Structure 1
């Protein structure tokens, strides 16, 4: 996800507290081990590589510091659970559409039945200065407007939008079916073949030819649901650079201290 979100001053306080642990564990040795021991005991207990053993009151204080270390681990893992598990346009009932703004402009294609359903109702009065002043010539222009992030949402027929949402990762069909009508056939009033065609429509509903077009054209495609990380990759980079710098200082410090010991 990120780098460390935990207020880097607090990480500095953690480092200074580790040095306070080192100071306390070396200055209290003399009350009955003052060179390199209690450094590695601080990096043993405060890294929790070893919680166990290795006068009395100094070690009482040290296990109080181990209690601090366990509480800090508990609090940071609680924050890792919190800030990863813890905390849109829903339809016409939004104040984004009841009070349509210019940061939220929306459109259709002119000379459509969708604009007819806009122009019939009364409460869409504030909407007509967006839905009639910004419109398109094709719905693919609105698709590109989503893809170019031009306009935030669009209002179209359900099936094509659900298909295209099942195609690519730019689209989610939100809201209910607005203006629930049927999809009919353009037939003149003196056309005598409203009859047997509608009988075939009854056959299509009853014998599942509607479901046959559901199989043969509708129901094919889906998308994923977001189910080896950026935090992980940051850990790889930081730990890799730290190991390289640490190893290339190991040679220098051990060489100088071996030639100190050769004296």
Structure 2
């Protein structure tokens, strides 16, 4: 939750800025305390509220206006970025069937197979377009059709392709 919506260096710079503003306000009391000014500056940004550390006449006044403005800007700029980053999360593949070109020419890092000698092999053979996909499947295919689901649930495979009804039942029952 810490520096990650902010740069890994901005925090020490804002600390140095708070100290600089506090000490300048503390040393602008000659126009006609140091701890009090430090407390007021350290508090206003942090939004806690301790001590009646009122400023001097007409100089620390404007300094306080601008200091409060900067503190509000920083605090309200944190939340915007964090919300943006959180909203822009949850990435995945979510294959939209054969329409996705990724599996129409995938690398070996992407795995997808089916049961051997079934009708799906016949259909894939009867297609002059997906010959390379047929070869990729034939590189590693399972003889059985029940151990394939277990292999997928063990994440060795993650793109099992098979007929409808068996898949619907095995997905409605096994949660994962």
TM-score band, normalised by the shorter chain?
0.7 to 0.9
Structure-2 separation of matches of 1:63 and 1:2: 28
* Contact 2:40 2:51 survives alignment (8 Å): no
* Contact 2:148 2:160 survives alignment (8 Å): yes
Offset of residue 92 of structure 1: 1.6
Change (3 A) 1:100 1:35: closer
TM-score (norm 1): 0.55
Change (3 A) 1:3 1:63: closer
* Contact 1:104 1:151 survives alignment (8 Å): no
Offset of residue 8 of structure 1: 1.6
Offset of residue 67 of structure 1: 0.2
Offset of residue 20 of structure 1: 1.6
* Contact 1:107 1:136 survives alignment (8 Å): yes
Task: Name structure 1 gaps, 5 residues minimum.
Answer: 170-263
**Aligned-partner SS, 1:4:** coil
Change (3 A) 1:41 1:118: same
Offset of residue 64 of structure 1: 0.3
Q: CA RMSD in A?
A: 2.8
Task: Name structure 2 gaps, 5 residues minimum.
Answer: none
Deviations 1:188-222 (A, max 9, x none): xxxxxxxxxxxxxxxxxxxxxxxxxxxxxxxxxxx
TM-score (norm 2): 0.79
Change (3 A) 1:168 1:42: farther
Structure-2 separation of matches of 1:90 and 1:109: 21
* Contact 1:108 1:135 survives alignment (8 Å): yes
Change (3 A) 1:64 1:97: same
Offset of residue 111 of structure 1: 1.8
- Tell me, yes or no, if structure 1 residue 147 matches structure 2 residue 161: no
* Contact 1:109 1:135 survives alignment (8 Å): yes
* Contact 1:45 1:51 survives alignment (8 Å): no
* Contact 1:108 1:154 survives alignment (8 Å): yes
- 1:62 match: 64
- 1:198 match: none
**Aligned-partner SS, 1:29:** coil
